[PDB]
Each structure stands twice: as structure tokens, then as C-alpha cells.
Symmetry: D2
Subunit: 425 residues, 4 copies
Amino acid sequence: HHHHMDKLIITGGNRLDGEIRISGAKNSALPILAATLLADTPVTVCNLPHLHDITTMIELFGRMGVQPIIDEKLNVEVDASSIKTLVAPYELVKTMRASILVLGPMLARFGEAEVALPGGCAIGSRPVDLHIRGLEAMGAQIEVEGGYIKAKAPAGGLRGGHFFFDTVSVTGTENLMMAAALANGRTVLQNAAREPEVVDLANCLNAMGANVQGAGSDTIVIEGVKRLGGARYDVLPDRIETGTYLVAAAATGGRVKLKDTDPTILEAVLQKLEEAGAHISTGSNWIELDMKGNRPKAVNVRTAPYPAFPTDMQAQFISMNAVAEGTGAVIETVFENRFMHVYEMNRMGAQILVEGNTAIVTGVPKLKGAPVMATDLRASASLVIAGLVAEGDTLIDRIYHIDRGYECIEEKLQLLGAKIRRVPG
Amino acid sequence: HHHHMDKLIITGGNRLDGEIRISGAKNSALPILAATLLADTPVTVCNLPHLHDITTMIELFGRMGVQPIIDEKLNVEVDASSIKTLVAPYELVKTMRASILVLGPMLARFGEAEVALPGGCAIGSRPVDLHIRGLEAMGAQIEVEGGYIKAKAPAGGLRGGHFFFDTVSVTGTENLMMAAALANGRTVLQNAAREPEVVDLANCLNAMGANVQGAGSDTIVIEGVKRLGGARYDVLPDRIETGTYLVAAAATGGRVKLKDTDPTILEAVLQKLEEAGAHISTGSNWIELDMKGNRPKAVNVRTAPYPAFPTDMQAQFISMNAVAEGTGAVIETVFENRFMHVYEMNRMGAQILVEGNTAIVTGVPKLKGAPVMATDLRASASLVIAGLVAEGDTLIDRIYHIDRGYECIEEKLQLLGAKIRRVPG
Amino acid sequence: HHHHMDKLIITGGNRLDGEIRISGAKNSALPILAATLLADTPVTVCNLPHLHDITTMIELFGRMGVQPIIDEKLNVEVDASSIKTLVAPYELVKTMRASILVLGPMLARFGEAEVALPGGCAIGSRPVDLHIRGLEAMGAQIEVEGGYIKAKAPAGGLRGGHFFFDTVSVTGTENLMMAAALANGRTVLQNAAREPEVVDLANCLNAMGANVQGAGSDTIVIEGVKRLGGARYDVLPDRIETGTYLVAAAATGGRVKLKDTDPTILEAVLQKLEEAGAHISTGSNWIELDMKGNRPKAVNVRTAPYPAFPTDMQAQFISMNAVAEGTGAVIETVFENRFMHVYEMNRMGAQILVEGNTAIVTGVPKLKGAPVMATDLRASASLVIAGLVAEGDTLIDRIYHIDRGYECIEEKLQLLGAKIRRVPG
Amino acid sequence: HHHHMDKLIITGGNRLDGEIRISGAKNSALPILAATLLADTPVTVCNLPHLHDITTMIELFGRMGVQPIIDEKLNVEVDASSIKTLVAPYELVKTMRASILVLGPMLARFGEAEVALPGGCAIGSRPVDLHIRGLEAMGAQIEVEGGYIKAKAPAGGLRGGHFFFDTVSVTGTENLMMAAALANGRTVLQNAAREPEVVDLANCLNAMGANVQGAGSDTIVIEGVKRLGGARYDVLPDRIETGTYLVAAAATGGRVKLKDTDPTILEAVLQKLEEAGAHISTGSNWIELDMKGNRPKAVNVRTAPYPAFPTDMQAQFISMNAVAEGTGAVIETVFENRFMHVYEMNRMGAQILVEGNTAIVTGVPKLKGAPVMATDLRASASLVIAGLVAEGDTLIDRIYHIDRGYECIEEKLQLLGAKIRRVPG
Ligand SMILES: C=C(O[C@H]1[C@H](O)[C@@H](CO)O[C@H](OP(=O)(O)OP(=O)(O)OC[C@H]2O[C@@H](n3ccc(=O)[nH]c3=O)[C@H](O)[C@@H]2O)[C@@H]1NC(C)=O)C(=O)O
Ligand SMILES: C=C(O[C@H]1[C@H](O)[C@@H](CO)O[C@H](OP(=O)(O)OP(=O)(O)OC[C@H]2O[C@@H](n3ccc(=O)[nH]c3=O)[C@H](O)[C@@H]2O)[C@@H]1NC(C)=O)C(=O)O
Ligand SMILES: C=C(O[C@H]1[C@H](O)[C@@H](CO)O[C@H](OP(=O)(O)OP(=O)(O)OC[C@H]2O[C@@H](n3ccc(=O)[nH]c3=O)[C@H](O)[C@@H]2O)[C@@H]1NC(C)=O)C(=O)O
Ligand SMILES: C=C(O[C@H]1[C@H](O)[C@@H](CO)O[C@H](OP(=O)(O)OP(=O)(O)OC[C@H]2O[C@@H](n3ccc(=O)[nH]c3=O)[C@H](O)[C@@H]2O)[C@@H]1NC(C)=O)C(=O)O
Ligand SMILES: [Mg+2]
Ligand SMILES: [Mg+2]
Ligand SMILES: [Mg+2]
Ligand SMILES: [Mg+2]
Ligand SMILES: [Mg+2]
Ligand SMILES: [Mg+2]
């Protein structure tokens, strides 16, 4: 029973050892839940991770007059044809900018949508101009007023169009894919995001009766249909959660077997772990990592859109490099100043120099436990890893960020022999 | 009585007109309050601004067993003789990293100090390695443990030394100046910060009986003295507050007379305002700005250490450029990621492209009111200015940031004819 | 007959109008010429552009004891069976770093290679660490000595391997593809370059008997074969030459029909030209652009690997933006300091601000003729375009750069009505 | 006798040991030679270094109709009374952009000037907007036409003005200082460059009858005078030549005593050398460095305007770090892409990673001799130093760059026991 004021207390010094199951991808669940707005019979979304971003998306639907049902198996059924209010309120959107994913499907299905324009997120520069322009390319009339994106479809509905992304955008690609699914005619999205969650969304849409081809490549072709039905869909495994537990095991010089995952959606990460000296073996749906008694070797990292190394794994590799042998350069090209975790790890004795988009990490044998503060729902997992490799106790506050991004992180780490406990708020 | 949950509601569209008084500099008050820890007889600090960072510094002193006396005029007398605990606790330091300013004076006066190592601040990369290295150059033995800087002076006290600043540091320069003031022998600080608050601290130290020469230049020479006495010091005017009200008047196409200020501590800002079309007249302690019925012209800005254009004025010039005639490039060289205000102004219909350290602003005639969120105790004043030039109402939340950095901002703006109200939390 | 000291003299002010034929891709010709070193029977390469990089590659082969034959139709036949010396000399490599393309095929075919390590190129940072690590992944043992990359295959020849490109690399992908073609076993290249020249190379290798699949996607799978035979291969059209003449037309407000090209290999460029106001029609192998005498509209541009907007078209869009209506931001993510053309255009009265990887262009109605200096075999084409839109005469020297990258540029522009002349050195 | 096609051949492996005399500063000589245009009686400039930039400035004066006389003591006397043509031609300016230094004095003394606008320099972005805007602040009306800055003073000549430098500019400060010296009234330059050469220029102007105060500080005040007379002026020692030979000695683990220099104009460099393990002693006009045969320790460096670490010493510290013990980060904030020397050193087996403005150097015990190419009149001295610490021979081409920036470099190194020879072109 997580609470906003929860903390984690970690005692470092244990080599991890054990097996856990990987949960469904948070960032596939979010767009697929938004996609349920397109369906005229109920959609059941399965393999959901139990983390707070799902709760927020469910709350958002509630504010629109749609009451999702969580069954005994913890799957979510959404029947969007009870929708009352075509508005995604600022009160909710300000807490989770991924809420913007309802813009595309709401507009395509219902002919109009008012969605709060996301403001600042501490991660970095994250405008949504390409979401707006892409929809305008489908005939949408859009204005910004009162802090809302106010969108209206042409008479007869959205029309298929060509749209070229000047910058690769994950949720931008997802938003336009969903809108295109019910548009009149052919849509071609160029320089599309290739992220596995984009493919998962396309596969869900096709299960609902859409015609989405090319997901996973630079070019997505959508032939719009008049209506979509509801299906039952299991979201793919979470590659960021997968990578995070592999790094935790590597950093502690231990080992882990991950089940219900997929090695083919984090090749960049697996290769970097092999560079760090990890012994890795894989199967269709499992990964085993074993350091076999060695400290990790420092590695260089460069973030970029999939299939390159993910910005959502960058912080975790800093915490591993922090206790590795040698010097590693960690470079961001996606979110150039996403390094808040560095300055917390500095409190724990890490040796890290930051210049612009580059973090230069000099590994030390062990960090030093200290209280630190989470701020980033994916990157702050690095603070948990840092705690695992620190002398003494590390007390992490503002865990609510981490609880947005990971299912019960301390319960899974306890199964791997970590000394970690949640301190109730 | 300010409350953590206060909001500001603004209605835009009024040309400002009136006169107000500028308060003492927040960032002179903070190091001068730290400097009072050096004295063996009480020091009284005057012309203090009534804002929350001073309250936090007073609370920090209390935690160490020093209870400042606040008189009827809100002057603060500090008697450090009662000090009980040579520790600046994480619980407080984590709320205000400027707390690190007590490290130098406590070490030099009392021979030891434990001060929590600041973690992350959302503004950007802000390590304090130069504070530590500088103190080590004076013979201090320093380790980081449990998240604390644990410092001990040699037997006989700190010794004079040479320290070269690889990067210009405002509080770094201040910390070492204070440590040097009671050290044994001569300290030379090279590539020193030239900020007017550094000069003000030196002038206060000298009033207290120190021997600090060269403040304001690249090189500060300190001859340590035996004891520092009991001065009554009026801190200099706040140049950021000054610039902020000047920009507010300019952005609204109105005018303002500022009293109890000093034009010579913001020449960069005055020149940029003239470039924007402002008519400016000055006297020894006042500034008058009048737009004479013109819209501001877009200007380019480049932040750098004093006397260059201040990073603490950068956001405010974005909000002016956002309603100016033409396109203006706003470039950070101090905090390359300090642009969170941009994304709030985008909710208000601003036209701003951000690429790394560069914000390209295309002016529009008027912004559009929307709810927005403060995050930065100096830069979020730009959201107040944006509200003043927006159509309709702008509701700003998390005002507690702004109340750290500005004395009663809505009360001063009311005197200039702004339609602005504090909504009590 | 070109000479190292040739100049171009341009008189601006004429709307271009006419049609020309597009030549084969220089950057397909170079890797395909390299690939002929793999074959045990002669390979004939057709549709070659007549420009200096081809001449340099042929000279390189000569230095290794391979003498290509240029027939009457200007096709090049290469019979690598006479090869004598497995060395790419520094004397030639220092003039053309793309010479490194012989490293992969020489190593795979002959079991060893010495190729001079390229030093500095004024474009910016261009290390070849991925070429080296990629070949090591196929069993190469590589040393750097005397300024040479000295590479040796393992017993029995190169072996199939897996390699993940941390950064997308065009010639790195090509080098590894060629080496994989004769390796023992399966090679998988991940995060591969998708440039059309990479596809063209794969298609030529397959025509020679190889088994290269997936070129054009991020994952290339190669099944090595023991030997490769001859082929007669026509290289695809040059998308950069195509883009350049389209911009030349657009910038002068003219029109042009380009024959023997392919719109599908420059979709990003075509879309940006439409944004600038151009009317574009296309056929299977032609593109026609008509400005209808209108001044172009300023556009924003962001370079990235194919299919995104190419760095090799960036400078050309600066020269169009230089005379456009409005302000356009031109952003590099590939070669972040490739802006030397800007400072030449400034001599012609362009209004351009550069900060880091961003050029901010404010368009003026016309430039002003002045003597300027080429430095970049592709980007300096922008100086020719600038001259076409300048008042009076523009004299460009160091044309030898441009002659590397474009087939007789003045002769093609003359066909479009340009007033341009080559001044013989 | 120097020739354009000269090369240097270096044999590495010797610890340097000896003493040489330091020459006058090139970058004081250049603006002081320009300043002679202000005087109505001959000025004699003394302690000049014998290097090619001086020769170019003398040739420039020649093209204007002024014939400097080089006397028996190799001092230069300039009598600007004979001047005939107020034009600095592109033919000369294109070879040395520092030629722009004649703009300010020509305009101030003669009421008009035409000076070619410098184009590209491979170092990176070097616009001269602040020179132009600064002179406009003194009443100049300026056009760019035919690639010339064409400048005209108002009726009665230049007028005292205020100018704030948005970015610190060395030659910008010098140009405005010279122009102000003959202007009618008071000029204030704010955020002025503090470089020692700026002080040296001011002292020479004052010797000539000017009234320049505050040079060396952020603020320079000039009271214009109607005429300036002659002077005999000895330029100060060259701090960059000084730094370079100290690094050459340190990199080889040797010793050197430098005479006729001044430790107080390179404190940042001396401190970094001590960090690298050098034992340094100084006197009023000499510096002695002794490594005692020890390998240097890696250091971090960050360039910035004087008195910070100079960009003109950056490359030399990369060459020392290249053979040092450890990892050193070398960061540019002045010329953020000035790293061409890195890629030549990579040919010699250096281990350097460049990302943006940061070079990460991993030291190795020795480099490996290879042919390399100079491109930068100050930074390419790093290639000479790299050759001194490389196994075998290093052949450096395009030595003419180095001959611009250093007086007879191989002759001075020979006095220290280097094995180095000039190969005549
Ligand atoms: C942080 C999260 O994950 C993030 C993850 O970090 C990023 C990068 O991989 O991709 C998703 O964000 P996103 O879709 O908002 O980010 P993208 O749009 O791909 O941003 C990539 C780049 O494109 C730029 N961008 C994006 C959209 C747009 O209209 N304009 C634009 O310029 C952004 O500024 C950024 O530089 C994840 N969120 C979801 C719901 O899929 C999270 O879990 O909340
Ligand atoms: C944000 C505030 O104001 C800030 C103001 O923005 C900055 C810049 O002018 O100077 C003061 O901070 P500061 O002293 O922490 O900042 P500085 O140390 O000058 O930082 C300058 C640059 O040096 C770097 N830096 C600084 C210190 C150090 O040890 N190492 C280092 O690398 C920082 O990362 C930054 O890039 C103000 N704070 C006070 C109490 O004077 C505030 O009011 O809370
Ligand atoms: C300039 C030319 O064209 C260039 C064209 O600009 C670029 C970008 O599209 O792709 C080819 O160069 P390239 O293959 O050397 O460039 P890429 O390797 O793709 O460089 C891409 C990025 O990767 C980086 N990179 C590349 C290789 C490597 O081992 N390491 C690395 O860090 C580079 O620094 C650059 O930032 C063209 N050359 C040929 C023969 O195909 C030319 O015609 O000579
Ligand atoms: C390279 C040389 O030395 C250079 C030395 O590297 C630099 C930096 O210390 O200062 C002089 O150049 P400079 O005066 O052209 O350089 P500065 O003007 O200080 O440039 C500093 C920074 O300001 C920027 N800058 C400068 C002037 C201007 O109008 N606008 C502008 O943006 C430049 O882009 C650069 O980023 C030396 N030249 C002379 C004659 O004094 C040489 O010897 O030829
Ligand atoms: Mg949030
Ligand atoms: Mg940087
Ligand atoms: Mg805070
Ligand atoms: Mg950038
Ligand atoms: Mg070249
Ligand atoms: Mg030059």
C-alpha cells in the first residue's frame, strides 16, 4: 500500500542472486489504454505493471466519464462508449504529461478534443509541437486557449495525410498512429519512432481491426477504417525494468535470471553489459546475467532513439560505472541535461564530472551511504542501484517518483537478496 | 502571512505605472549572515529583504544553537557566542544549498564543521568541489561521510594560501574569503567572482575589522586577522529585483521609477533594456524606465558571470521577448538547462524554440492566460511578467519558490497598477 | 580540364529555368568501387559521376597495383587480380578519408590490410573507432603503428560476428558489410545506417553473389560466402546533387526539372522545399520544382541520419534561408560544428547567428557579391547558391573542394540559365 | 630562412634540459603596430618576436602606403604620415584576420576606413559583430559591401560612447580602445578583455599621449585626445610561448629555465603544471620548471578569458595529458570546436575522446611517431610536443602555420636538447 511520503532504506554490500519476473511495459500500457478510446466494444488490457502511471491514466478516464474496471486478475477493461466529457483536465495532465496520448484517439473517434498542453517536466525540453502539426496534417483545426489544446476534426472526420517527423518522437508517433487508425484514407508517417512500444501499439490496433503496417521501421502506413472493436491484449515486457535489474545485478557483482522478458528489445543494453564484463545468456523469454566474481568494467554510453541505448537506462549505467573499474563517458543526445541523479550520487561519494551532455564517471570500489532524493520516475532507479553498492545505509526520499516508474521495486530486489525496506509515509 | 500553498492570480493588459522601493540583496544577505559566525562580538545586518531564504538561514543558525535577534525594523543581530553544535544538518541544507556558506566561517572561527553536501537542484549542474579544494588549500582536512562535508582545520587554525578558481564561483569566492579572514597569513584568490555581492561581503568583513582587498577584481588578497568585531551593516540593493521590475514595466509597455537601488550594479541589463527601446534615466540611487507607448523590440541575451548579463535575469528577458517585436536569441553559458519557464510560457501561447543552451523567441502581441507552475526562486518571476502581458487570467501555483527570491512581489506590483492578487493557501 | 587553382565567378539575380540530368551517387560509387576488391572476376561500375573523389579512388587502386579501366562510355572496370600491395598509403588517404572503405574488403579478401588512419577533417570530429571495433568483432586483430591501421584476420579468415553501432555510421556500416560478405558464417549489424547508398552497396554485393539482407533497415544480416564474382552495376542517382539543384532553383524563385533521379531518396528535403513555398511534382525518375517567382519562406531544419534531413544538404538550406522571408533555425545533430559556410555568407551580407550546433538565419531580399572561399566538398555548394542570389559578382576560390563533390557544377547551372563561369587556374 | 613548404622532423624520447630566452608577445605586437596609425610622429616598437604574423602586418601597412623600417636592433619604426590608401585589402586580410585591428585606429585618425570582413577560420566561430557595434556606439556608420566593412565617422570625427561587450573580446576591446583614444569625449568599455596584451596596448597608447585608464579590469575609461605622438615601446613577454616551452619540458619529464618572461601573466598555466607534478620556481623575469624525470600526472583544464586558462594553451595540455598518468578532461569555453590537433595526435596513438567542447584524454606511456598536419598557428605546437614524446620520428607538414605563431621553434627546442630538424621546402 504505497503512500506519497514513503521512503526506501537500503543497506549495501550484497551480491544479488535470484530470479524475478519482468512486468508489462509501462510505456506500452499508457498508449494502449489511450487507444481504448477508439473501440466501440470493450478492450481488456493485460499484463499491466502495478505502478502509479497506470492509476493516473485510469483516473483520467474517470474524469472523462469512462469507468475502467480492474478485475481479479488485475487486468483493466475499458468501455469508452459511456464517455461524457471530451476533456483531459489540466489538474490531471499537469501530473503526467503522457496524458497527451488521449488527444489523437479522442479527436479521431469523437471529432473533437480539449487536452491540457503539458508544461515543464524537470527531465528537459519536451515540447509537443509535432503532435499538433501531425494532427493538423490530418485536417484538424487546433488552437491553444486557456492552456488547452482545442482540436476539432473537419466535417466527415480526420483525413489521411503524409507527415514527416523533424525529430523522432515516441508518443508523437503513437498519437498520430491512433488518429490515423480512424481517419478517412491513407496516412504515411515518416521518420517514425521505432521503439518496441510503438510496435506493440500497432499490434494492439490491428487486433482491434485496424490496418497499421511498418511499425518498427522508419515508415508507418495506416489505412484508416470506419470503426474499431474491442480486443484482449497482453502488453509486451518492460525493457527498461529488464535493463534496470540486469544493471543492479552487474553493479553488485552478482547475478540474476529474468523471466517473462525479451532480449530482442534491449540489444544495446545487453551488449554494453557484455562490454562491462557480464556473462549473459538468453532464451526466447528469459535473460540470465552472471558477473562470476568480477567487478564491472567501465563502459562508454551514448543515448539515442531505439534501437540505440535508451535515455531511460542512462542513469542506471552511471550508477554501475560509479563502482566500476576505470573511467566511463556517459553521453546524452535525447535529454541533454538529464543528470540530476549524478548530484545525488555525489553525496554518496561518486566521482563524476558533468560538462553539458557528458558525464565522466571514475569508478571507485564502493560508494558511501547517505540520504538522497528521487526526482525522475525512471532515472531515479539509479539511486536504488547506488544504494546497493554503498557502504552502510542509503535513505531515499520522494519514492513516489520511483513508484510511477517501477512495480514494487523493493519487493523484487528482496527476492534477489538485497537488503532494502519500504519505510511507510 | 505567506503559506506554502499560496497562488497568484494575475489579469493581464495594464501598462505599469508607479514607484516602488528596492529591497536589500538576498544574495548579499545570505553570505553576510554566514559571515557573522566569524565575529566575537554581535553583528547587526540591516536593509534585509523580507523573503524566505533569510528565514531559512535564521532557522539554520537556530539548529546550531545561535538565536538571532530580530528587531522592530526587521534588522537581524547575530551573537555566535552561544553556538552549541557545529553541524549544518541535511534536513535544512537540502532545502537551500546556499546553506553551504556557513562552511568557511565555521571552519575558520571554530576549527571544525560538518555541513551536508548539497545534492541536486533542478536549475542545473551545481557541484561544490571548488569550495572543498579551496579550503584544503588553507590546510583543512576534509572527508565526505554520511552525506556530510566533515572538515577540520590544522592545529593553530587555517593557514593563508593561494587558490585558483578553474571556474568562476560566486559562493565559492565568498566561502574562501570568509575562511581567509581569520586564517593565519595571506590568502590570494585568483579568477575570483566579481559579483557586487562579493564586494558587499568584503566591505562588511572590512567593517568588522578584516583586511580584504581587491574584491570586484579577478584577484582578492586577504590578510588574516585575530578577531572580527561588531559592525552594523546595511546590505546593498538587490540588482535582480531591480532588473525584474524594470523588465515588468518594459514588457507591459509602461513605466516605473525604482528607489533605493544602484544603476552601476546592472549595466548589462540597462543596456539591453535600451536596446529593447526603453527610455532610461538614472541617479545615484534611482532608476526610471519609460516605454513611452512602444512595444519592446526583441533583444539577444548571453548569460555569463558579472559584469555580464546575469543568469538570474535570463527568464525575465524571455518573457519580455515573448511579447516583443521580432526574434531574440537567449543563450545560457552559466546554467545551460535553465529553461523550465519556457515550457510554462508555451502553455500561455509563447513562441519559443529551445535547442540546448539556446532559446529562440519569436514575439507575439499578447500571450494567453493559463494556469502555470513556478519552480525556480529567481527565474519563475518570468511567469509573473508573462501573466502581466497575457490576455485574461494567469494562475501561478508553487509561489513558495517566488517567495524565496522576492519580497512580497504582488504587493510591489500592486503599487505599479498591476491586477494581481495572492490566493491564500 | 579542372585545375587546383580554378575559381568560379557568379553573377546573381537570374531566376533559374531549365532541365538537367542527375548523375550517379558519389557516395555509392566510392563504397562500390571498394567492393570490387572482393571479386575474383572483374566488376564494371556504371553511371559514375565525373568528379574528383572517383579519380582519387582510382589512383588509390593504382597504388595497390590495381589499374581500373575507363571505357568509352565512362564506366569503370576493376580487375583486382593484379593487386600487389595491401597498403592504402597515407599520401593518398590524407586527401580523402573515405579511402578507409578499402579496409573491410581488403581484410576480408586477403586476410590483412594496412590503411592509413585518417587525421583531421575541417568538418569536425570524425573518428573511426566503430570501423575498428566492428572489424575486431569479426576477428580482426588491429594495431595502430606509423600512422597506419594494421589489421590481420584470424586463422582461416574473418569470422561472422555481431556488432552494435553506438552511433549510426554510413561508411562504418558499409565497411563491415563488405568484410562480412566473405567472412565465415553469419554477421548481424545492429543500429545500421539506412542511407540509400548502403542499400545500393548491398544490392551490388548480392549481384556479385553475396547474401546481404535487411539493408535499409536498422538490422543487416550477412551470410558470408567463400568467393564473389563479377557484375555490371549501375549506381543509384545522387540525392545530394538532386537536393542541391532543387534548392538553387528555389532560392532564385525559378523552376527546374531534374531527370534520372528518384524522389523517394530525399523525401525530407522535398517536404522542406514545400514548406519554403515550392510547388513540387514528381514522376518515377524525375522531380520538377516551380517557385513561380516567389521569394522562399524561411524554414527550420534539423539534420540526422537518413531518412532524416541530411547534413550534406544543411549548408544549402542556410543559403536559401539567407534570402527567405522570415527567420529559420538550422540545427546540426550529425556534424555539430559544420558551419564554415556561414562565415563566407556573412561576407556577402547574410544575417546569421551561430551558437553551438544552431544557426539562426534572418532572411534578407538579396545578398551582396563578394569573394569567398570554399572548404567543404558538399557544403560549399551553398556558396554557389549564395552567389546566384547576390547583387553583382561572387568569386569563389578553392573550387577544387566543390569539384570533389559535384560533377561540373557550372556546366549544369549554365543549362539552367545561371550566369556562372570557371576561371582556369 | 623559412619557406611555405617546410616540414619539421622530430625524434622523440629525450628529456629536455636547458634554457632559452622568451620573445615579445605576438598578440601585443599586432595591436601595437595597428596603434601606430594613430600617431603623427614615428613610433618604434621593440622586443618583437621574429615570426610571420609581424611580416604580414608590415606588408599590410605597405599596401596602405606606409613603409615600416626595421632597424639594426630588429625594432620596427612606423611613420604613418605617408599613408595613401585607407583600405585593408581582402587579399591580405584573408590570410590573417587579426588585420581587422587597423579598423579602429584608421577610422579614428582619418574619419573613414574600408577593411575586408574576415570570412572563415578553421578554429571555429569568430564573428566580429562586437567590433562593428562597438564602433557604431562611437558614431560610426558602417556598411558591408563587396566583402568590405566600410566605415565612416560622423561630422567632426568619432564621439565618446558607452559600449558593453556581450561576450569578452580581446581584439574587440583593443579596436575600441584605439578608436576611443582619438574620439571626442569620454568612452566607457564594459566587460572589457583583461588579457595582458590589452594592458600592454593601453600603456603604449598612454606613452603616445593618450588617456586610457582601467585596462586589466572589466571597465576601461578613455578620455579622447586630439592627437597622438611618437613613442619607443618594448612589448611584454609572450605568455603563450612561455607556456608552450614549459609544457614541452614537463611532457618529456625534463627541465627548463625561461628568461625574459614574467610568471604573473600565466598563473593559471603555472598552477596546472604544478598539478601535473612539475616543480616550479620563479623570479621577477624568469621561470624554472623541473619534472625530475617523472611522468606527468593528468590534469583537467577549462579554457576561458584571462586570467583563466587560455585557449591558446589548450592543445599543448592535451599533448601533455596524452602521455600523462591518468585521465584528464580538457574543456573549451572560448573556441568550443578547437580540437583538430586531437585527430592528428590520434594518428600517433593518443587515446582521446571528443564530445562537443570536451576532450577526454587517457594518458599512455609514449606516443608512436607518424606524419601529421599543422593547421593552427598556436594550437599546432601541440603536435611538436607530441612528437617529442613519441617513439621514433614525427614528420609535421604545413609548418607555415607554426611559423606564424612561434619564433624559430625548432631552434629554441634544439637549445633544450630536442632532436628536431627543419626540412626545407
Ligand atoms: C520519461 C518517460 O519516458 C519517455 C522516454 O524517456 C522518451 C524517450 O525514450 O520517450 C517517451 O517520451 P516522449 O514520447 O515524450 O519523448 P519523445 O517525444 O520521443 O522526445 C524525444 C525528443 O523529441 C523532442 N520532441 C518531441 C515531440 C515534439 O512534438 N517535439 C519535439 O521536439 C523532445 O524534446 C525530445 O528531445 C517516454 N514516455 C512515454 C509515455 O513513452 C516516462 O516513462 O514518463
Ligand atoms: C540561484 C540563486 O542564485 C545563484 C546564481 O544563480 C549563481 C549565478 O549568478 O550564483 C550563486 O550561486 P552559486 O554561487 O551556487 O553559483 P556559482 O558557484 O557561481 O556557479 C557558477 C558555475 O560554476 C560551477 N561550479 C561552482 C562551484 C564549484 O565548486 N564547482 C563548479 O563547477 C557551477 O556548476 C556553475 O556552472 C547564486 N546564489 C547565491 C547564494 O549567491 C539563488 O538565489 O538561490
Ligand atoms: C562529407 C562526405 O559525406 C559523408 C556524409 O556527410 C556522412 C553523413 O551523412 O556520411 C558519410 O561519411 P561517414 O560515413 O564518414 O560519416 P558517419 O560515420 O556516418 O558519421 C556519423 C557520425 O558518427 C560519428 N562516428 C562515425 C564513425 C565512427 O567510427 N565513430 C564515430 O563517432 C562521426 O563522428 C559523426 O558524428 C559520407 N561520406 C561517404 C563516403 O559516404 C563526403 O562526401 O566526403
Ligand atoms: C588565434 C590567435 O589568438 C587569438 C586568441 O586565441 C583569442 C582568445 O584568447 O584572442 C584573440 O583573438 P580574438 O580577439 O579574435 O578572439 P576574441 O574576440 O576574444 O573571441 C572570443 C570569443 O568571442 C566571440 N566573439 C568575438 C568577437 C565578436 O565580435 N563576436 C563574438 O562573438 C568569438 O566567437 C569567441 O568565441 C587572439 N588574437 C589576437 C590578435 O590577439 C592568433 O594568435 O592568431
Ligand atoms: Mg511531473
Ligand atoms: Mg558542452
Ligand atoms: Mg530546492
Ligand atoms: Mg546544442
Ligand atoms: Mg581533406
Ligand atoms: Mg587563415
